[PDB]
Design a protein around this nucleic acid. Structure first.
Ligand SMILES: *O[C@H]1[C@H](O)[C@@H](N)[C@@H](O[C@H]2[C@H](O[C@@H]3O[C@H](CO)[C@@H](O[C@H]4O[C@@H](CN)[C@@H](O)[C@H](O)[C@H]4N)[C@H]3O)[C@@H](O)[C@H](N)C[C@@H]2N)O[C@@H]1CO
Ligand SMILES: NC[C@@H]1O[C@H](O[C@H]2[C@@H](O)[C@H](O[C@@H]3[C@@H](O)[C@H](N)C[C@H](N)[C@H]3O[C@H]3O[C@H](CO)[C@@H](O)[C@H](O)[C@H]3N)O[C@@H]2CO)[C@H](N)[C@@H](O)[C@@H]1O
Ligand SMILES: [Mg+2]
Ligand SMILES: [Mg+2]
Lengths: 68, 197, 227, 130, 154, 178
RNA sequence: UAAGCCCAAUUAGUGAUUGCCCAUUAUUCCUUUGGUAAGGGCGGAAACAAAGGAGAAAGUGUAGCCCUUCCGAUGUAGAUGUGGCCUGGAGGUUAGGACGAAGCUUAUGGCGUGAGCCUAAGAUGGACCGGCCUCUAGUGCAGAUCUUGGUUGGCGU
RNA sequence: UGCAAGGCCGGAAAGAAAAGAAUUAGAGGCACCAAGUGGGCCUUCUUCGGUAAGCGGAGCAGGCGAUGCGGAAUGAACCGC
RNA sequence: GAAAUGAGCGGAGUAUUUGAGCUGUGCACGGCGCGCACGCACUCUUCUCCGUGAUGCUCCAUGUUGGCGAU
């Protein structure tokens, strides 16, 4: 027949056995998808230059090793 | 009488012995448990602890992967030094997709019949861990590698696959069976391919 | 015997080296414990002078408010609320009659107000510190609880070149110093006996006629029945 | 042989851990069976009840397994098994197996005096003279 | 609360303070919000447009999104055994810039005030002595605390 | 019985603030079992009279007051107590004891019997040794007679804890058991 | 003249501490057992007949490789581990038995924390069977108004 | 030349002073696999329906359930542990 | 006593340097618009020194005085 409807009794004690796992830092999972798109397309233009600068810097770090 | 509430949850699972039945892994565990305590080298610590590990946790490496990371270290090596001895605790497989490779010296726990041939045909050498305990007994001038665990089928099935964000694969023997409701936007909903965090 | 001779010729050097380091540390603990005893006896005379210079002209000497508290846990581990239970963990008071030295600043007093029915605290003397460090003071060496036996084992623990003997630890505890935290986090929580002669009432404050709460230096005679 | 000696045999418990309430039932063996009863007084550890086997009742390992003579016991079946107990002689004692016949116990009991190996169940009359 | 709509139990919560009514002020429009800044979501009725939910009203988090009239802000919400990071998006009137790191940028710039007086010059403000030391008391006034008879007749 | 209360003179003060650069110093007489109780009765009265807390608080002194020569005096222990019905009743209660701290102890033992009031529901005011000709009640004034002379009748002469017995011999100082 | 009620003491205006009685608590001393355990020793130092002795294994787990040290220990439902025990058969090895095997019996002790194992005595039996490593399963009883056989109190009613 | 963004180069860095100015029997972060449970009940305090209830329903915590032991003569749940 | 690690068992001596007194001189403290109750700096009381690795990896074996015990 009738029983107990709703209770919040054990739950806060259950929630702290494996802890309240805290928030994760702001350098993990900082995806910019869904952000304002004119500034998202601009930043892609810049990262495609920063990658070929990184390809050129490492290639320039090798010729500064084969000569020394 | 002590209030040790979250003290069993601080415990971890270590397993100092091996589950393997191989009598030649047990000889390397006889050798590298000796070297792990009797030497301050962190090589023999890691080589002993990775030798205990299971066959799933000793994922194999490919020969074209050894040939690329040894290249990217021999770029900034002075050419008076030779090269490290590549050591993997696991299996080296051949790579069809990389024909010519340098003369590198590889110590693995097992080689293929074809990964052994393409190493020695390039001027190289396949070693073993009793033979690595004699030349560099502490791991001086080595390069310890693992082999890739992502990309496995089992890792690609790990997940819910119908909560948002999850791109895991369903356990389905039929490929064209689970493709309709909850997987197309026309069939009442489609699970969101992206979720923040 | 060609290998075994070089080992005992190297063991011969390590015997005379530990015999030198034993007497070298005997002197710099004899010398350093004399320095502290002059301070404990001389600065105690200074406040007897200032309190007579105060009383002669009708003035008052406000004594310095105590910087060190000794905190023993007097109630067991049953039926404890999770705010009171965490503070008793962060004070390292996890069993009955465990005792810790704490500083007496505002972050620590507002933790001691929150757990008063479970603890009995107060202000220790010099003899309360040195009886707790000598008789029942142990250390956390290699993650293990080992009893203070010689000052070489203390000097091997802290590696501070200021804490080399057992009088250094009763110095930093009694007069706070730069290394109060490293000395007290160096030791294990003190585990005392129950007091001889009894407890009057566990369940009421010291002002109400019972036992918990603050004792404004009366905690020494209560710990002197436990150490 | 005389046995090698050690500290005195403590024996935390000499009473057998018998079954709960076995005396009332002729079926029930005295071998220990653990109570899984939800209202069992032995399982719930009341005051006047039988005890339960536990790791704390275990025996002092320096003196564990040794018999009241001072000897551990090694079961032997023929004469060639006396030859194992020649160096291990003040530690172990021979126990001739039950199914060893009366004819082969002569050959074992002769040599166990020659070779000076204690038998736990043999030639105790002859070891009393010498 | 017998209904589980969006604004339920928000009677006193989405109201405005006494004699503080009106449309938002010009210094809220001119206050420019930048990505990576701590803001402080406080829902402003008299806008009634782009409000946060009632949970995100005392809350304060990091801006991750700036759109022409919107601010995304990452706010921690604990659910069962974990604190996941909710990325809500509000109108710009429902955020205030947060003064949470004010006392940390104060002692940071005090560490370029010092180190600009130690390496080059020598002039420093003196360190403050504790009031918890034991001084002498010169009594300029004494009373007697005694609980007079006439203290009860009130 | 060498009484259970001690006469503490607790001197204290609020604190040197910047609002109040030099605060008022207060004197306080309290009869307490020890000085930890005595300091807290002082900060009870600093709170309910001066809005001063013990957190923002200095105890400048808490010292005992030694008694006197032991002489039979008459003490007016002007004392007040709280009951839930008819709260804060104040009485005067002249007593007859050798010391001032013992006179207040007698007041705490018959505020406990005549009225069932406990330690923390009692405040004690102005304990003073008064002369004989000011004593008003005749149950204390009857001891000022210079020729008192009463007999110790109806006594309980017990043995001296070293020679006490269980069975003595009915007309005899023996001990057949114990 | 409380062994009642409210206060208060601790051997009593004597000279300062803690009247004493009871725990599966506390402190400490032993023993066991398990660790997210932590350290040390393991190249036989020399030497030593009978008429000071034995051990020393590079090791998850044993009758634990041997020592030293530290901490924890209860628990339903539940999970797991066990060179943990037990039964039928199979592959191997090592042995018992007409001088008495299996089975049965027990004021037969021994030892294992325990499941159990082993010895002894039968004034019992009369021909088969043990131990260890592996393999296998119709493999462990106290209760299912459990199944089948027998017996029993009621009752010489 | 400002602004916003992503990098690059160099500098400094009480590794956070002093003012009561923290403490920790504080190894952090991931993942796989799967049980049992999904009838609860009691209590200090807050509280709703009721005249009330050893009644019905909630909140925060602690307990019994699942756990004895020492006490309240006896008592699942109180006191101590 | 099968490594007795000692203010204790040994050697080697007549003293060692801890307090209590009584103090100098600076400073600090306390009052004023000279004090220092002997804080910081440089005669009484007390025993003081040096000693022994493991050439032992581990375990177990050595008192005294009666009572009982003569196969
Ligand atoms: O992979 C996740 C993980 O499964 C989950 N536990 C958690 O990790 C926590 C971490 O929690 C410990 O993780 C251990 C096992 O995963 C566990 O230890 C205990 O586990 C039990 C059985 N698994 C017991 O057998 C035993 O008591 C003990 N080993 C947890 O203590 C916490 O310690 C960290 N503080 C925080 C981690 N988030 O999250 C993982 C994320 O996927
Ligand atoms: N990008 C730098 C390099 O990345 C390497 O790893 C790169 C790849 O090797 C690796 O790709 C692996 C692939 O190897 C393996 N066979 C399958 C696996 N799923 C891939 O993983 C990647 O690819 C899938 C594509 O959707 C992504 O969803 C997934 O997030 C990502 N982990 O992930 C990285 C691709 O961005 C190495 N970590 C290392 O050499 C180096 O850091
Ligand atoms: Mg179970
Ligand atoms: Mg069956």
């Amino acid at each position: 027949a009738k029983s107990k409807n709703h209770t919040n009794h054990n739950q806060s004690s259950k929630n702290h056995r494996n802890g309240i796992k805290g928030p994760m830092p702001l350098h993990l999972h900082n995806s910019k998808r869904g952000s304002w798109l004119p500034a998202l397309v601009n930043a892609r233009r810049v990262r495609k230059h920063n990658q070929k600068a990184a390809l050129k810097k490492r290639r320039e770090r090798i010729a500064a090793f084969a000569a020394k | 009488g002590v209030d040790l509430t979250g003290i069993s949850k601080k415990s971890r699972v270590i397993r100092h012995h091996t589950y393997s039945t191989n009598p030649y892994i047990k000889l390397l565990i006889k050798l590298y448990k000796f070297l792990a305590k009797r030497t301050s080298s962190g090589f023999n610590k890691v080589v002993y602890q990775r030798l205990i590990k299971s066959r799933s946790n000793r994922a194999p490496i490919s020969l074209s992967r050894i040939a690329v990371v040894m290249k990217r270290k021999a770029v900034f090596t002075a050419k008076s030094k030779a090269a490290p001895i590549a050591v993997v605790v696991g299996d080296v497989l051949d790579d069809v997709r990389m024909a010519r490779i340098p003369a590198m010296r590889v110590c693995a726990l097992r080689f293929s019949k074809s990964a052994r041939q393409s190493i020695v045909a390039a001027g190289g050498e396949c070693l073993t861990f009793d033979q690595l305990a004699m030349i560099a007994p502490t791991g001086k001038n080595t390069y310890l590698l693992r082999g890739r665990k992502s990309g496995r089928e089992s890792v690609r099935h790990f997940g819910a696959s119908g909560v948002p964000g999850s791109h895991s694969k369903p356990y389905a023997t039929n490929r064209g069976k689970e493709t309709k409701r909850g997987r197309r936007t026309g069939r009442s909903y489609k699970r969101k391919a992206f979720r923040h965090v | 015997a060609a290998f075994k001779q070089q080992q005992t010729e190297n063991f011969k050097k390590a015997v005379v080296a530990r015999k030198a380091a034993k007497a070298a540390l005997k002197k710099t603990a004899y010398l350093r414990a004399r320095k502290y005893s002059r301070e404990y006896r001389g600065a105690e005379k200074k406040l007897v002078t200032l309190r007579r210079q105060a009383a002669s002209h009708g003035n008052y000497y406000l004594e310095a408010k105590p910087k060190v508290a000794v905190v023993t846990r007097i109630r067991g581990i049953a039926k404890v609320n999770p705010k009171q239970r965490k503070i008793l963990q962060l004070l390292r008071l996890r069993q009955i009659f465990n005792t810790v030295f704490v500083k007496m600043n505002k972050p620590m007093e507002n933790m001691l107000r929150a757990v008063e029915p479970y603890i009995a605290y107060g202000y220790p003397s010099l003899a309360t510190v040195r009886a707790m460090v000598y008789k029942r003071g142990y250390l956390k060496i290699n993650g293990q609880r080992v009893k203070i036996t010689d000052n070489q084992m203390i000097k091997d623990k802290y590696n501070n070149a200021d804490i080399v003997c057992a009088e250094d630890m009763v110095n930093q505890i009694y007069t706070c110093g730069k290394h109060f935290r490293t000395v007290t986090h160096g030791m294990w929580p003190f585990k005392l006996a129950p007091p001889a002669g009894g407890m009057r009432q566990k369940r009421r404050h010291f002002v109400e006629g019972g036992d918990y709460g603050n004792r404004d230096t009366l905690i020494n005679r209560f710990l002197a029945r436990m150490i | 042989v005389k046995p090698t000696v050690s500290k005195a045999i403590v024996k935390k418990r000499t009473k057998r851990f018998t079954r709960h309430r076995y005396e009332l039932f002729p079926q029930l063996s005295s071998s220990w069976r653990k109570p899984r009863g939800e209202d069992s007084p032995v399982r719930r550890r009341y005051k006047g009840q039988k005890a339960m086997p536990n790791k704390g009742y275990g025996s002092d390992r320096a003196t564990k397994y040794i018999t009241p003579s001072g000897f551990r016991s090694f079961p032997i079946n023929n004469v060639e098994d006396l030859y194992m107990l020649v160096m291990q002689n003040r530690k172990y004692a021979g126990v001739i197996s039950h199914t060893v016949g009366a004819r082969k116990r002569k050959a074992i009991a002769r040599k166990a005096m020659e070779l000076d190996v204690r038998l736990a169940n043999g030639n105790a009359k002859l070891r009393k003279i010498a | 609360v017998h209904s589980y709509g969006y604004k339920s139990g928000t009677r006193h919560l989405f109201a405005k303070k006494f004699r503080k009514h009106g449309a938002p002020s010009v210094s809220t429009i001119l206050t420019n919000i930048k990505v990576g800044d701590y803001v402080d979501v406080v829902a402003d009725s008299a806008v009634r447009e782009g409000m946060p939910h009632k949970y995100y009203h005392g809350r304060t988090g990091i801006v991750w999104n700036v759109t022409p009239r919107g601010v995304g802000v990452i706010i921690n919400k604990p659910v069962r055994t974990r604190t996941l990071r909710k990325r809500i998006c509000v109108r710009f009137e429902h955020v205030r810039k947060s003064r949470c790191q004010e006392a940390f940028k104060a002692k940071e710039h005090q560490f370029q005030a010092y180190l600009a007086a130690k390496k080059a010059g020598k002039a420093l403000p003196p360190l403050k002595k504790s009031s918890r030391m034991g001084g002498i008391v010169r009594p300029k006034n004494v009373e007697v605390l005694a609980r007079r008879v006439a203290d009860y007749e009130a | 019985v060498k009484p259970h209360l001690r006469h503490y003179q607790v001197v204290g003060r609020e604190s040197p603030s910047e609002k109040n650069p030099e605060p008022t110093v207060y004197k306080f007489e309290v009869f307490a079992p020890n000085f930890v109780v005595a300091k807290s009765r002082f900060w009870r009265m600093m709170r309910v009279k001066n809005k001063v807390k013990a957190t923002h608080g200095d105890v400048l002194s808490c010292k005992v007051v030694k008694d006197a020569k032991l002489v039979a005096r008459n003490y007016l222990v002007d004392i007040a107590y709280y009951s839930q019905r008819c709260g804060y009743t104040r009485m005067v209660k002249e007593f007859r004891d050798v010391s001032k701290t013992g006179a207040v102890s007698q007041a705490y033992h018959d505020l406990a019997s005549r009225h069932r009031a406990r330690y923390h529901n009692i405040e004690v005011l102005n304990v003073k040794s008064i002369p004989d000709h000011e004593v008003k009640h005749l149950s204390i004034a009857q001891y000022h007679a210079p020729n008192l002379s009463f007999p110790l009748l109806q006594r309980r002469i017990k043995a001296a804890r070293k020679d006490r017995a269980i069975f003595v011999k009915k007309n005899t100082k023996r001990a057949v058991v114990a």
